[PDB]
């Protein structure tokens, strides 16, 4: 099936996975620019050396952040689209090789479907999925109320990545679609502001709730 030229691939330049350059990738949102790392790098695997230090995740390449985000079960102690998704012995917890391959196949599908550099489409999706206003909870008379606040850029980035991953996780659960295809679909839908995207709808809902509680 897979040609031998792809099974034994030897790169010669420093670019993402030896296949895609990020030299023309632009980040439009001024708040998210210092936190989306795009410095040239071949293998996106830093072996978890960033979590110890405060604000360490800022200098981690965005593709590795995405790979880390999908290395999970998905629905452990809260429901996604109305269900727990507890996968346990057949999850991707700690299996970084399989997650890496999922991201690679999704990138190839994205590039074939749209004709653009996949990193750019991913950046557009995370820009459209990042909320700008949220809420905090107060208690009075045994009743819980909302109060509107602003969101820092690092939390915006984390929430956008988490919701993209959860949308992909829901689209492939007990259906004929595969994980790579679901991820490519979610990224493309979020890039175009289609309400069929989990992350974009979640983003709209959060902003609406924050707006109606000022």
């Amino acid at each position: 099936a897979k040609p031998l030229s792809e099974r034994f691939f030897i790169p010669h330049e420093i670019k993402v996975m030896g296949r895609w350059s990020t030299e023309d990738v632009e980040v439009r949102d001024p708040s998210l620019k210092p936190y989306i790392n795009l410095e040239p790098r071949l293998l996106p695997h830093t072996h978890g050396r960033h979590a110890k230090k405060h604000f360490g995740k800022a200098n981690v390449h965005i593709v590795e952040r995405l790979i880390n985000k999908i290395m999970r079960s998905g629905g452990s102690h809260y429901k996604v689209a109305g269900h727990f998704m507890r996968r346990e012995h057949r999850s991707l917890n700690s299996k970084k090789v399989k997650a890496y391959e999922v991201v690679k196949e999704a990138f190839k599908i994205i590039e074939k479907r749209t004709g653009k550099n996949p990193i750019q489409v991913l950046v557009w999706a995370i820009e459209n999925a990042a909320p700008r206003e949220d809420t905090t909870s107060v208690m009075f008379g045994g009743i819980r109320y909302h109060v509107a606040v602003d969101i820092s850029p690092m939390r915006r980035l984390d929430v956008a990545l988490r919701n993209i991953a959860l949308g992909a996780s829901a689209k492939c659960y007990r259906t004929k679609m595969s994980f790579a295809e679901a991820l490519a679909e979610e990224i493309i839908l979020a890039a175009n502001k289609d309400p069929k995207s989990y992350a974009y709808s979640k983003k709209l809902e959060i902003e609406r709730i924050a707006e109606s509680s000022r």
């Binding site: 031998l4 030229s5 034994f8 030897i10």
Partner: protein, 149 residues
């Protein structure tokens, strides 16, 4: 070119195809009916699985000789599903391995070192390394980095 210069699975495939020409390699009469070990569930799906197992055993003797039945039984074992109990490792059986080694000796490719096991003969080394050379020649047409080796 040697066995060390090519991927193992492709070499096993090529060697298995070439082994069908040697008259001394023949599946036993019980071959259509058995599993390859207590940790499997279903019979082999290839009608010509005997030749693949024989080729794998020959390459194993080439790389790790001298070697005997028990250690090969370790190599061909695996994980077993035990119903409601947790999965566990188990060894493979011995009849397939012992018969394959006896047939290979009948063909002159291996020989017996007393109290130590079986080792590859110069004939067997030449047989394997020629096929490896042929595969490597084909291989470096599409992977130019393999010409330096």
């Amino acid at each position: 070119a040697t066995v060390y210069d090519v991927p193992g699975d492709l070499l096993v495939e090529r060697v298995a195809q070439r082994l069908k020409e040697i008259p001394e390699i023949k599946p036993p009469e019980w071959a259509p009916f058995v599993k390859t070990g207590r940790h499997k569930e279903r019979l082999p799906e290839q009608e010509d699985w005997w030749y693949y197992r024989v080729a794998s055993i020959l390459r194993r003797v080439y790389l790790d000789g001298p070697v005997g039945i028990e250690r090969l039984r370790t190599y061909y074992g695996g994980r077993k599903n035990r119903g409601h109990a947790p999965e566990r490792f188990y060894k493979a059986g011995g009849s397939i391995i012992r018969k394959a080694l006896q047939q290979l000796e009948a063909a002159g490719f291996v020989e017996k070192v007393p109290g130590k096991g079986r080792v590859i003969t110069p004939k067997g080394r030449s047989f394997l390394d020629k096929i490896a050379t042929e595969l490597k020649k084909e291989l470096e047409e599409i992977i130019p980095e393999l010409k330096k080796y």
